[PDB]
Amino acid sequence: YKCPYDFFADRPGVRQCTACPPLDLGGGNLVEQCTEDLGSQRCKPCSL
């Protein structure tokens, strides 16, 4: 199955997509990360 919208996977043979992790751009700042397309393997900061 394609990974869901906010989930991603990198290793080819995998058993579960992992939720996108909040990117930390410094000290104590966490920006939520969300993928653009449905079946994706990388997380963008989902404010942009």
Binding site: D10, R11, P12, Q41, R42
Partner: protein, 64 residues
């Protein structure tokens, strides 16, 4: 006699220094993201089955 006339004005002062241009627009372009490292190995195979049992040597005598 009458008095002499005034002098003319001076010119019109100098324009101020033309400003320098803008930045060279953008540093280096897109930096390639980190790698998607790792790809594990395959589990070993199962073992084999055993052979069948040996028969029963069915012979005692004829008893005459």
């Amino acid at each position: 006699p009458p008095p002499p006339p005034p002098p003319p004005p001076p010119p019109g002062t100098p324009d101020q220094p033309a400003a320098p241009a803008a930045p060279a627009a953008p540093a280096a372009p897109a930096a390639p993201p980190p790698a998607l490292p790792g790809a594990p190995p395959p589990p070993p195979p199962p073992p084999p089955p055993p052979p069948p049992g040996v028969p029963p040597a069915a012979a005692a005598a004829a008893a005459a």
